[PDB]
Amino acid sequence: RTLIVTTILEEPYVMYRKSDKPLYGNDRFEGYCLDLLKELSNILGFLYDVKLVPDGKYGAQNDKGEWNGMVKELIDHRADLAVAPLTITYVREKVIDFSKPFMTLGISILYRKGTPIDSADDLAKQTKIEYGAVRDGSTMTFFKKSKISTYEKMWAFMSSRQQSALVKNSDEGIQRVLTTDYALLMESTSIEYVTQRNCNLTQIGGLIDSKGYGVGTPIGSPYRDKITIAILQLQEEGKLHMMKEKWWRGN
């Protein structure tokens, strides 16, 4: 066959390949997820056709409870697999299958090096260093929904003053950390990408939660089990580690 793979542009998982002339088909894209897709293809033996998700969304439910994004593409059988940094959540797991995670991670703190701040507790107990998250992002939502005291206090601070401590998107957030006295709460995968490329920034403290990214399949897929096993094989052989360093290691 040719499997249709839904995916989404997200640096450095899936990016348009630099070119001086128009590119076509799978040659338009490169990145960690394209390399993962290639390894999966080699192990399981399938051909594939990468299609960016038309609405540019990962997948969530609206007020009606209808799904969108890559999740919807799988539900509607317009895609055979989603190979993207798609977070495994029980709400999605109800409607699609997920492989074993190919990346495990958690929320953490991006800030400057050389300071006395060593945890979320240290941020929460003060107000001089501003801190926040990308508005309407996965991490902001974690804080908004937390029932843990420290994280409730943090959300109160973040959501205070008309949410001035929140940012529009990740690049704005990263530049806010660089230019001002500000700490950004974000997924640790994104933090490591930034700290690899900005020597004066660091992850502060450990991970505040745990989550993982998995390959999405429609429920009933003949590829479900085989994908999990292939990811286990790639982890054991050190290949996931190699592909991560390929795309994350920076200047």
Ligand X SMILES: O=C(O)[C@@H]1C[C@H]2C[C@@H](CN3CC(F)(F)C[C@H]3C(=O)O)CC[C@H]2CN1
Where does residue 104 rank: exposed (0-12), middle (13-18), buried (19+ CB within 10 A)? Answer: middle
Give the one residue of 9, 60, 129, 229 binding its own copies; rule: CB under 8 A: 229
Q: Is 85 annotated as a binding residue?
A: yes
Question: Across the chain, how many H-helices and E-strands are there?
Answer: 10, 12
Q: Which residues bind ligand NH4 (CB under 6 A)?
A: 93, 97, 219, 225
Closer residue to its own copies, CB minimum distance, 41 or 104: 104
Minimum CB distance to ligand NH4, residue 82 (Å): 13
Residues near 56 by Cβ (< 8 Å), separated by ≥ 6? 8, 9, 69
User: Which among 138, 27, 144 is positioned nearest to 85, based on CA atoms?
Assistant: 138
Question: Which residue's structure tokens are 């945890």?
Answer: 119
Size of site (CB under 8 A) for its own copies = 30
Taking the CA atoms of 10, 14, 18 and 24 in sequence, report the sign of the dihedral they define.
negative
Query: Do 201 and 113 contact (CB within 8 A), yes or no?
Result: yes
Give the one residue of 106, 130, 135, 248 binding its own copies; rule: CB under 8 A: 106
Q: Is 92 annotated as a binding residue?
A: yes
Distance spanning both ends of the chain, measured CA to CA:
41
User: Which among 7, 30, 36, 15 is positioned nearest to 239, based on CA atoms?
Assistant: 36
Residues 84, 86: Cα–Cα separation, whole Å: 5
Q: Is 187 annotated as a binding residue?
A: yes
Q: What character string, x for contact with ligand X (CB under 6 A) and - otherwise, covers 133-172?
A: -x--xxx-----------------------------xx--
Closer residue to its own copies, CB minimum distance, 28 or 153: 153
Q: Binding to ligand X (CB under 6 A): which residues in 120-139? A: 134, 137-139
Q: Binding to its own copies (CB under 8 A): which residues in 26-85? A: none
Q: Which does 68 bind (CB under 5 to 8 A by kind): its own copies, ligand X, ligand NH4, none?
A: none
Report if residue 94 touches its own copies, rule: CB under 8 A.
yes
Query: Do 26 and 35 contact (CB within 8 A), yes or no?
Result: no
Report if residue 147 touches its own copies, rule: CB under 8 A.
yes
Residues 154, 21: Cα–Cα separation, whole Å: 48
Read off the DSSP letter of residue 169: S
Of the candidate spans 6-14, 45-53, 177-185, 235-243, the one that interacts with its own copies by CB under 8 A turns out to be: 235-243
Q: Which residues are annotated as a binding site for L-glutamate?
A: 85, 87, 92, 138-139, 187
Residue ranges binding ligand X (CB under 6 A)? 10, 58, 85-87, 134, 137-139, 169-170, 186-187, 190, 213
Residue ranges binding its own copies (CB under 8 A)? 88-90, 93-94, 97, 100-101, 104, 106, 145-148, 188, 205-207, 210, 212, 225, 228-229, 232-233, 235-238, 241
